[model samples]
Target: MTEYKLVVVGADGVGKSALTIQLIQNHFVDEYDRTIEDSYRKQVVIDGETCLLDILDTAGQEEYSAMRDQYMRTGEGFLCVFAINNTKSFEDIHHYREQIKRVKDSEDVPMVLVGNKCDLPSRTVDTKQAQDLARSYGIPFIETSAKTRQGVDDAFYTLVREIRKHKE
Candidate 1:
């Protein structure tokens, strides 16, 4: 058994909480009124390993960012998310990446870049551009639709698998 601290950070209304809810609750919420500062704990089986996953689905706004470093300090892995329909949110992902890098004090860490809300017909960010950004960060990139239940598990499961790899 392995315990993992996985935090999800993304812009407000960018589907961070939505993605998390779909992963843990198996329900798709059409709307997330705000960022969820609360944390949840669950036992999940990933790659045949039972994991005690502690997830922190946090706010994207700067005001909620004061304690990010503290959260990052305890995180075993991270899921940096952005909304595909919002270009500004896509651009903001770089800032979040730097936050984790600074708090963790290393470039080598288990992390993933997620483009959420891919079910929308209108997407402001290009897949190639997002993939390029993820490549620059040396991490994996995935697109998810919380409404469609697509790629949600892959994003979390991939991170947990990577975290386990880093540990063993």
Candidate 2:
């Protein structure tokens, strides 16, 4: 069976846990307790492939930045998240990317830029900005809403597909 290690990362309250839970379980927690340490585990595949998703949901606070290096080292792919409603969270993507590269010793790993919280249209961040950032990194980008289930599968499966293509 093919196995993939994925890391969900970004600033605090950017909905990393929410996105992870939604994609892995197809359910949402109304009031999610903040992730303290990293949550690491293997998730069974929902698709036909006999693959395991090794997920690392990292704490988003800057104080936990050191822990990110360890998580990045184990990651085969990345789901770099930012809340569409929070511009500050969007800005932290670069920091996360740099840290991942530093620890992983490579910038070529497949990464999918995820803009979460699409349920709040009025609180939206600039889609063009997000797309531009992803383009600069040569990665794909998609807006998602864990609460409303918008683009959740796209964010997860699209990154997996990209990783497969890269391996080919």
Candidate 3:
């Protein structure tokens, strides 16, 4: 079985853990512990492709910033998430990307920019900002809602497709 490592990152309270749980188990927890300074592992199959997805869900709190480089090193790709309601979190995506690059020392790794929390209509981030950020990084972007299950599968499948293509 092929193994892949993917990281989910963003600022505190941006719903990184929520998104991770929803994608991996298809269930959302109303109350869960923040990631603090650790990563979680889960296995998932997409299109009959069995793979181990080491989901490095980092703490959004700045206090854990020291460990960011270590987590970045373990992932083959990343799903960078930002809450649609938090523009600052969205802005941090670029900084996170740069950190990933510095630690991984590669620009060719597959990345997916996810604008999460689409379930909240009043909290929506600018679609154009998300699109422009993704374009700037040359990565695919999708709006996701762990609450409603919107674009959850598509976001992950798109990453798989990108990785598969890169391997070819």
The lDDT per prediction is 0.85, 0.81, 0.79
TM-score for predicted model 3 compared with the true structure? 0.86
Candidate 2 residues 5-106, lDDT tens each? 778878889888888888777888676778564654554564667677777787755675655655577667888999988989888899989977887778
The candidate that achieves the highest TM-score relative to the unseen native structure: 1
What alpha-carbon RMSD in Å does predicted model 1 have with respect to the real structure? 2.1
lDDT of 1 by residue, 66-137 (tens): 456556788889998998999999889888888888888888789999999999989989999999999998
Model 2, residue 5: displacement in angstroms?
Answer: 0.5
Kindly report which residue pairs in candidate 2 clash with one another.
none
- What TM-score, over all chains together, does every model reach? 0.91, 0.86, 0.86
**Order of models, best TM-score first:** 1, 2, 3
Off by over 4 Å in 2: 38-48, 60-70
Local error of candidate 3 at 112, Å?
A: 0.6
**What local lDDT score does residue 160 receive in model 3, on the 0 to 100 scale?**
75
In candidate 3 the C-alpha lDDT for residue 106 amounts to 86
Can you write out model 3's per-residue Cα lDDT over 1-168, one digit (the tens) per residue?
Answer: 787767787777777788877877789868777755456666678789888776767775655464466557666677888899888888788887887787778887788999988989777578898999899889999999988889987887788778787778
Better of 2 and 3 by lDDT: 2
Task: Looking at model 1, report the run of 10 residues with the lowest lDDT sum.
Answer: 60-69
